[PDB]
Structure formats: C-alpha cells, structure tokens
Paper text:
[name] (TR) is a suitable target for drug discovery approaches against leishmaniasis, although the identification of potent inhibitors is still challenging. TR structure from different protozoan parasites has been extensively characterized by crystallography, showing that all key residues are conserved.
To validate the predicted binding mode for further rational structure-based drug design and ligand optimization, the structures of TbTR with the most promising compounds 9, 10, and 14 were determined by X-ray crystallography. The effect of N-piperazine substitution on binding affinity was assessed by introducing a methyl or a diClBn group in B to afford quaternary ammonium salts 9 and 10, respectively. However, this improvement does not seem to relate to the interaction between the positively charged ammonium and the protein but as shown in the solved structures, rather to the larger inhibitor structures, more efficiently occupying the binding pocket. Remarkably, 10, endowed with a completely new chemotype and a Ki value of 0.2 μM, stands among the most effective LiTR inhibitors so far developed. The densities observed inside the trypanothione pocket for both TR dimers provided well-defined results for some portions of the compounds, namely, the ethyl-p-fluorophenyl and furan moieties, indicating that these common portions anchor 9, 10, and 14 to the Z-site by van der Waals and electrostatic interactions, as previously observed for fragment. From the interaction network, it is clear that the furan and the ethyl-p-fluorophenyl groups anchor 9, 10, and 14 to the Z-site, consistently with the binding of the initial fragments. It is also evident that the dichlorobenzyl group—when present—protrudes toward the MBS together with the phenylpropyl moiety, making a T-shaped π-stacking interaction with W21.
Numbering used by the authors:
A (entry chain A), B (entry chain B): 0 to 488
C-alpha cells in the first residue's frame, strides 16, 4: 500500500520508452518503471506494451503489405510459365488478420516476459500522468478523476506516449475509422475511401486493393494536387501512376465535407467539390497528433510547441530540468528507429556520463507501397534552397523481369542529389522492389559523408536494381541558385 | 587493299570488351574494332555480342531464378490467406525459355544498333587471333587454316575472350552438358545431377528444382565436404540446409568417375566411391577456364600464368607492349562488373592521361540461390590470417513472414567481420531475401572505411532485414592470432 521509488519512470512502453527503460536498467543498473495502458494489442486502446509500431503500426502493416504483394506475384508468375486456375483465386482477409494477430500477440507476450524477468525494470498497467516534478500517478483511465492504482516516485521522468490518429471535424465523422480500426475489420471492404496523401493512406490503399471482394474498388482522396508530400517529386508522380495502373482510383484536389448513411447502411460521402461517392468504409489517415492530453502537463508546467508537441532541446530536455520527451510526442520525425535512437541517447547522457544527441538528418525511411519507396536525405527542391549548385543523377526504367511479368508500368526510379561544388551526396531516392532493403546501407554512406564518386568507383553487384546507384557519373540536370537547368551555363 | 587501320582492336564483344571499346571511341575519339564469333545468343557458340553475362550468364539465369522463386511464392501465399487450386499448378519450362530467349535477343539487337549509331566503333563477325604485335586476323572459324575475312592493323590489342566451362577428363564426359546447354534444354529434366559446389551448380539446382516435372529430383554433388568454398562458413551450412529443405539432395565428398548412356537415353553416373545414379541430364559446373587456345598467343609470345590465365600487371598489360587482357581471360575475379571496371581503367590509362588500376578487394557479389547470398570483403578465416584480433558479429533468425508463410527453414543470416583493434569492417555476409540488394551500398561503406560503430550509430529503416546490420553492438566470438575463441584472452 506504499508508493514505489525509481531512478526513471517512463510513461509509454513503445519504441522510445522501451529502449530507454531497458538501457537504463541493464547498461547502468538504474531502477526503472514503465507504464502502459494495455498488455496486448487491439481494442479498446489499440496501442499497448511494445508501442504503436508492434501493435497497430510498422509490424502488422508490413505483414499485411506482404500478404497483398501475392496479388502481384500470382498474376506476374504467368509470364515465367506458371499455370494454375486463375478463376479459383481467393484472398481470405480473416486468415491474414488472424495470422497478424498471433504474430503481434507473440511479441506482446515476449515483452511481458522481459519485464517479469529483468532486475530493476518493472511494468505498471494504467494511465500515467504527472502529479509533480518527482511523482507519476497511474490511474485506471485517461480521466484524471479515475482511481489511483499506483504513485511512482521518480528522480527522472520520460514522456514517450507517442501519437494518435487525427479526425477532421466534419458532419458524420462518427461513420469513419482510422488505421487503428482498419487492423480489425472483420471483413475486407468491397468499397473503401482512404482519405489522405501520406504513407498510411497509400499503404492501406494497397492492402485493401489486394484483399477486396470481386466487385470491389479502392479510392484514395487527397486535398492537394499530388500525394506523398516530402518525398521526391519524380517518385510522387510514379507511385500515383503505379497505384492507378493497379486499379486504385486517386482523387486529388478532393476532401470529404460530410458523411451520411444510405438506407442500406453504406456510407455516402460528399466532397467540398459536390462530387459524391458511396463506400462501405471511410478510413481517415490525414495525420497523427502528439498524445499530450492525458499527461496533465499543466501540473508541472511542461511547455508544448504551437503545433502541440512537447518542446525539447537537442538532448530531449523539456523546460522542467528532470523531465524528458522522445518519439512522436515531440511532433518531429515520426519513425520507430528515431524514437529508439533518442531513447538510447537520452539514457547514455543522463545515466551514462557520455553526452550524445540524435542526428535527425540523413535518416533512411521507407513507404511499403506496391512497389515500395526507400529514401535517405534531402529532396532536390530542399537541397536547392541551401546549396548554390545541386546536381541530380536519375535512372528510370522498366526492369527486364517486368517486361516478362507484364507489369510494364513498374518503373524503377533511382535518384542521387548532390552538392555539385564538392560532390557530397545530400539525398538518395528509390522506387521499386527492394528499395527499403537497398536504402539502409545508403544511410551509413551518408553518415560517412559519401560523395557521388564514392558511389561510382564502387563495383556493382550484377544483376541488381541497386547497381544503378554505382553507375551514375554525369548529372541529368542541375539546380543553380534555386533554378532547374539541363546544363551548367 | 581492303585491310583497315584501328587505334584499338578488342577480341571479345563481352562485358570488358564493350566497356573498353565504347569508352575508347566516345570518350577518347579513337578508331575501335571489336570482334565476336556471333551476333546473337545460343547454339552453336552460346556467347555472342554482349558476352557470357548477356547471352548465357547473369541475365538469363537471373530471369530463370525469378521464375523458380514463384514455386515458393505460390506455396507461401497460403499463410497470408491466398486460396487457389494447388492441384492445377504447373511450371511451363518452354514458356520460360522462350521468354528468356526474346529478352536476350532484344539485348543482342540493341548492341547491334549501338555499333551502327556510334562513330569510331566497328563490329567484325568471326574468330580473332594474333598474327603479330600489331595485326589481329579474323577467320571464318576457330580453325587457324579457315578463310581470312579481315586483317586489322592495331596500335593497341585488348584480349577479352572470357572463360569456358571446364569439363573433367572422365570416360563418358561427352554425355554431360555445361551451363551453356542448360539454357536451351527443350524440356525441363526430370532427374538432374549438377556437378560442382560453386554458384553456377547451386543456382541451376534451384532453377531445375522449381521446373522439374512431377516425381522429379535434383541432385547436387561436390567432391569436398561443404559447398560454396570462399563464402562465409555459416552461410555455406545454412544454404546447404535450405536447399535440402526445398527438396535438393546434396551429395558431398562425391565426384563422377564415369558416365554411360542408358538404352532409354538417360545417363548412368558412377562416382569415385562406387555409388551410382541414373539422371536425364548431368550438368558439369566444376569451374571455368580462360579462353586462350583460339588466340594463337605463341605468334607474339603473350605469357600465361601456370593456371592458364593471360598474365597481366595491375594495369592489365601483358609482357608484350601494346597488348592488354581484362575480364575472365586473366583468371582473377570472374564477375561482369570487375571486367567492366578493368576495361574502363585500361582505356583511361592507355588513351587518357588518367592512369587507373581496378581495386579487386571489397568487391560485392551475390549467389541467386533460393534464398540468395550477398557478400562483400573478407570471410573471418581469411581476416584471421591477416589481422591479430578479428571480431565476428552474427545475427541468425527466421523472419516473421516465414513463420506465417510456413517456410520456417528460411533463416536470414547477417555477419560483420571486423579488425577488433580499430573496429574497421573487413567483410559483410548476408543470406536471405534481399541480400543481393542490401549488399550493394555496403560495398560503398567499405570504401569510406566504415567501422562497426558507423553501422550501429546509423538509424535503422524499420521494418527490414537490412536494419539487422545497424543493430549488432557485441561480438559473438573472435579470432586471436588465427585461433577461434568466444572471449578475449
Ligand atoms: C499505421 C502506422 C504505420 C507505421 N509504419 C511505420 C513504419 O513502417 N516504420 C516506422 O519506422 N514507423 C512507422 N510508424 C510510426 C511508428 O509507429 C512511431 O513513430 C513510433 O511507434 C513512435 O514510438 P514512440 O515511442 O514515440 O511511441 P509509441 O510506440 O506510439 O508508444 C507509446 C505508448 O504509450 C502508450 N500510452 C499513451 N498514453 C499513455 C499514458 N498516459 N500512460 C501510459 N501509456 C500511455 C500507448 O499505449 C503506446 O503503447 C507507423 C505508424 C502507424 C500508425
Ligand atoms: C552461368 C553463369 C552465370 C554468371 N552469373 C554472373 C552473375 O550473376 N554476376 C556476375 O557478375 N558474373 C556472372 N557470371 C560471370 C560473368 O558472365 C563473366 O565474369 C563476364 O561475362 C566476363 O566478361 P569478359 O569481358 O571477360 O568476357 P565475356 O563476357 O565472356 O566475353 C567474351 C566474348 O569473347 C567472344 N570470343 C571468344 N573467343 C573469341 C575469339 N577468338 N574471337 C572473337 N570473339 C571471341 C565470345 O563469344 C564472348 O562474347 C556468370 C557466368 C556464367 C557462365
Ligand atoms: O532489369 C533491369 N534492372 C534490374 C537488374 C536486372 C537486370 C537483368 C536481369 F536479367 C535481371 C535483373 C534493367 C533493365 C535495363 C537495365 C539497365 N539500364 C540502365 O539504365 N543502365 C545503363 C547501363 N549500365 C552501365 C553502363 C554500361 C554500358 C554503357 C554503354 C555501353 C555498354 C555498357 C550497365 C548495366 C546493365 C544492366 Cl542489364 C544492369 Cl542490371 C546493370 C547495369 C547501368 C544500367 C537500361 C535502361 C533502359 C534501357 F533502355 C537500356 C538499359 O537494367
Ligand atoms: O521479421 C523479422 N525481420 C525482418 C523485418 C520484419 C519485421 C517485422 C515484420 F512484420 C516484417 C519484417 C524479425 C523477426 C525478429 C527480428 C529481430 N530480432 C533480433 O534478433 N533483433 C534484436 C532486436 N532488434 C534490435 C534491438 C533493439 C531492442 C533490444 C532490446 C529491447 C528493445 C529494443 C529490434 C529492433 C531494432 C530496430 Cl533498429 C528497430 Cl527500428 C526496431 C526493433 C532487431 C534485431 C528478433 C529475433 C527473434 C525474436 F523473437 C524477436 C526479435 O526480426
């Protein structure tokens, strides 16, 4: 019936909080408490022990995109001489969802095990909030009036509560779902609208498109001209064509104004334009917002940015000296490995006596579109605002295997962006099979300040898509003080 | 006086020959003649315009491995909810061969077009040999007494005739085939013996295993204890295990003593051990030897190594001034990209004022086994004879998608070999889906003298197999003065 005392209390057992907690306890012998709202994935709170990534993010979406790729594989097999009864082919969504659920539960169960087993690393179930500088309260619900399960005394407090889907305030929003519900749909939708131009909308569009019943149709809508803002424009344009080529309708310059129920219970969507669409599911994927609401940060005066994130310095420190924030709650790069790196850096700094800041530049990342994106570093239009002379090396071709497969639309894109003044690689952008696998080691290259000549003097592995990166010596074009041109004056 | 005058005569229109020829003409404005024995692929001379890679190597074999992969994709799809009539599934070899033939013939025609469209680059059909220091004779056939077609006066001669399958001197060797004939088999063989432990025997075993008719069996035999000599030991053991899991019988410590014809037109193999096996096809893949016999190298005194390669210095010069050799004929690294690099280097040296030598260390390479190998730099047993303290970082697991697919045997292997005294990455060895793509940029990393800490300080792309390379911090074991031990002494 007594409070417990820790060196470190972590609110959120996800990618950042688990890295921080494990490292503090096992590398530096600190007493660590980690709080989360649920021990295993799914409703009601979706995220759980292991975080968004394990439960309703990276791990399950990747298993589901892997399942969806078999639609391409089954059709593309025919060109290589594979024969079977095409009329017999069915996509069983319930088996996919059941296989994903057992894989996720197995990870939930192993994290549970690590906590029951490790010296000075304890798990507390419930909703963590800040009572004071040195006390974390664990309550039965997000409501600050719900019953107190524990009070955790903390010399240091880490906020790592991640993010949550954003729902626009439109009439009939209650007829719409987020990515969270999409993971548990009992049946694959015949007709689905995915709202948003980001990786989550694109990734789900691919998944629904493979698993849709026979009469089915996937529509993606986006309020602006071109999906996947922040990615290379050539790649943005090519992914649009390859989604369309695979039967996904892309509605750009369109946004839902309202949703109502038809008498048959299907969703009637009215866009701002006055266009209408009937679907069985409306999935909002317009963005994710920092999960700061439930932490009662007012109790200790932890400052939020204008945009809603916990404000931090380069060492993840809030304005309250012993309170830190890492991961999606800081509203910057929303990636698992960035959250993990921030967690490991924080603990080495606070407990390890070896200060270290996370480098947020030159981070490798992927989109598991079909086919996928792999990217690291600057897109050319950003490079062009910070460097007087920028060169772009571009190779774009239908791979030979896709001339046999019949997916001629599957153009491989490889782009390298440089500072032409010294040849430093600023950015590498890939579209096509293996692009996420190719881009990891490119991340090491950029952290070692690689120049285009470091790439072109490296001997290719043949035959691969990757060898295109080691075969480009003459720019396709330049930017000179922000202006695009084929040649230097 | 028809005879014609050239700066460079290249014998062999292959990987190395065409790089050299193209660069000499388009970069250095030289007069270039290139000789090959055939304009397009296949019987009777197999190699042709484009070289071994284009016609009977890398390109057709990758397309045929892509075909073989579909056997795994169709089975694995079931775990992700794909349902279809398994009984109706058949692999059509003839359709694969015809699709490969059209892809390759398109490349042959494109190279024809390249000669026609390029100034100072001329193609001659026929058999090239050395008449004197500065004359290349082109005859109708490999016979030195056949009709002369051209006599090419040349300031510089490039030997680039590549390699040829080694056939052992055993009774009934004439009832055996090589990789050359494998590319044109009218029917997929029902029982086949691939002879050799190297990458060609392993790749073909996979190809024949996918396309074998019902009741068929692929056997691979190797004269020593463990296949794929020169690859990482862990990967050699695991690929052996994974080939066995996919139904390929691996016969180690076995070597054909003789082959005889059976009355049904099948082959009767007797091993040195006294064991016997009946097969439809015996594919010998025990090695490749330099293609030097038809060149009449005795006419000018070009020196050969004891092994049969054309002896060259670091700049690809023979003992005879103004005569060079690149690619497989030099019997060093038999990889297309290495031949291409040597060709470029040679032309830069001879006709630029840019003396360049090919670095034959830290060349990335692949085996298109199912699943595949990607490797760059030293295996631990070679590292441990050149360095006092070697650390080995090792990661080995079934990827989660293969727990769902049911191919539980598909262990991904990642190994980093370091100079432990200073953390320098010496070698990276990968077995798993994507390994050939993951390894290309690793090639670039080893030219920026990456340390293990440069890998583990790089932020991961999640979820990928590749991120394993950025997640290994602690050696699994070491070699100290050549001797393996789990701990530093
Ligand atoms: C659909 C989807 C796909 C994604 N795909 C990828 C991808 O492929 N690659 C990638 O790198 N990233 C991906 N992401 C992003 C990645 O999931 C996040 O960047 C990462 O999980 C954030 O880690 P974190 O530690 O900040 O928070 P999280 O991992 O979100 O963990 C926060 C935890 O805190 C808990 N929590 C919240 N409030 C409280 C409270 N008051 N008390 C206690 N516990 C609380 C939550 O239950 C959760 O478990 C994806 C995200 C989504 C939604
Ligand atoms: C089955 C197989 C698979 C392979 N897979 C790969 C792989 O995946 N990756 C890789 O990097 N390497 C691979 N290789 C090796 C690769 O093909 C060679 O290393 C490369 O082609 C060698 O280039 P080269 O310029 O030395 O000769 P080649 O490309 O062989 O060119 C030699 C040319 O000379 C011609 N010729 C020969 N004698 C004469 C003469 N007297 N006069 C005129 N012309 C002549 C031939 O017709 C031929 O076109 C593979 C090899 C084989 C056999
Ligand atoms: O498919 C693919 N990819 C993937 C991989 C592979 C391959 C093959 C196979 F079978 C499978 C798979 C492809 C297709 C194509 C290609 C290439 N390319 C490209 O752009 N590239 C370029 C080239 N390279 C470099 C240079 C060299 C030279 C130049 C001139 C003359 C002669 C020579 C080469 C190469 C080649 C090849 Cl094939 C590869 Cl793969 C790589 C590399 C670069 C490239 C191209 C494009 C387009 C066209 F139309 C053509 C072509 O790709
Ligand atoms: O499947 C796969 N692969 C491929 C990719 C993928 C994923 C997912 C999906 F869905 C699909 C696909 C896998 C499985 C598993 C793995 C890994 N691992 C390994 O062994 N590793 C280790 C871990 N990691 C690293 C480290 C970190 C940590 C530690 C401790 C605590 C905490 C943390 C993990 C990670 C990392 C990173 Cl970088 C990120 Cl970003 C995330 C995560 C890894 C390695 C493991 C194994 C086994 C088990 F059971 C589990 C796991 O894999």
């Amino acid at each position: 019936h007594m409070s417990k005392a820790f060196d470190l209390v972590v609110i959120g057992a996800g990618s950042g909080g688990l890295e921080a907690g494990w490292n503090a306890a096992t590398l530096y012998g600190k007493r660590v408490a980690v709080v989360d709202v649920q021990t295993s994935h799914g409703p009601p709170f979706y995220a759980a022990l292991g975080g968004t990534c394990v439960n309703v993010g990276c791990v399950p979406k990747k298993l589901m995109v892997t399942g969806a790729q078999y639609m391409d594989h089954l059709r593309e097999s025919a060109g290589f001489g594979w024969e079977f009864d095409g009329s017999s082919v069915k996509a069983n969504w319930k088996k996919l969802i059941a296989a994903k659920n057992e894989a996720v539960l197995d990870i939930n169960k192993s994290y549970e095990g690590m906590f029951n087993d490790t010296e000075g690393l304890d798990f507390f179930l419930g909703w963590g909030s800040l009572e004071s500088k040195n006390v974390v309260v664990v309550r039965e619900t997000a409501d600050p009036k719900s019953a107190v399960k524990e009070r955790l005394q903390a010399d240091h407090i880490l906020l790592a509560t991640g993010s949550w889907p954003q729902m626009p305030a439109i009439p009939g929003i209650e007829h719409c779902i987020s990515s969270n519900e999409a993971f548990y749909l009992p049946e694959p939708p015949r007709r689905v609208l995915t709202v948003g131009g980001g990786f989550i909308s694109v990734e789900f569009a691919g998944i629904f498109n493979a698993y849709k019943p026979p009469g089915g149709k996937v529509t993606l809508c986006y309020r602006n001209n071109l999906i996947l803002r922040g990615f290379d424009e050539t790649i943005r344009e090519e992914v649009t064509k390859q989604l369309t080529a695979n039967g996904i309708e892309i509605m750009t310059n369109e946004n839902p104004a309202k949703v109502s129920l038809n008498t048959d219970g299907s969703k009637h969507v009215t866009f701002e334009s006055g266009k209408t669409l009937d679907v069985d599911v409306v999935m909002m994927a317009i963005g994710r917002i920092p999960r700061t609401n439930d932490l009662q940060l007012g109790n200790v005066g932890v400052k939020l940015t204008p945009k809603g994130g916990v404000q931090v310095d380069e060492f993840s420190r809030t304005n309250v000296p012993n309170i830190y924030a890492i991961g999606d709650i800081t509203d910057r790069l929303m990636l698992t490995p960035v959250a993990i790196n921030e967690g490991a850096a924080l603990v080495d700094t606070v407990f390890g006596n070896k200060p270290r800041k996370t480098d947020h530049t030159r981070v490798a990342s992927a989109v598991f579109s079909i086919p996928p994106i792999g990217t690291c570093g600057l897109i050319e239009e950003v490079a062009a605002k910070e460097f007087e002379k920028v060169a772009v090396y571009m190779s774009s071709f239908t791979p030979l295997m896709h001339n046999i497969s019949g997916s001629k639309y599957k153009k491989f894109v490889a782009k390298i962006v440089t500072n032409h003044s010294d040849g430093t690689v600023l950015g590498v952008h890939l579209l096509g099979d293996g692009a996420p696998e190719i881009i990891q080691a490119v991340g090491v290259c950029l952290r070692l300040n690689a120049k285009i000549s470091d790439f072109y003097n490296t001997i290719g592995v043949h035959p691969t898509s990757a060898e295109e990166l080691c075969s480009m010596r003459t720019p396709s074009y330049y930017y000179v003080k922000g202006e695009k041109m084929e040649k230097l004056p």
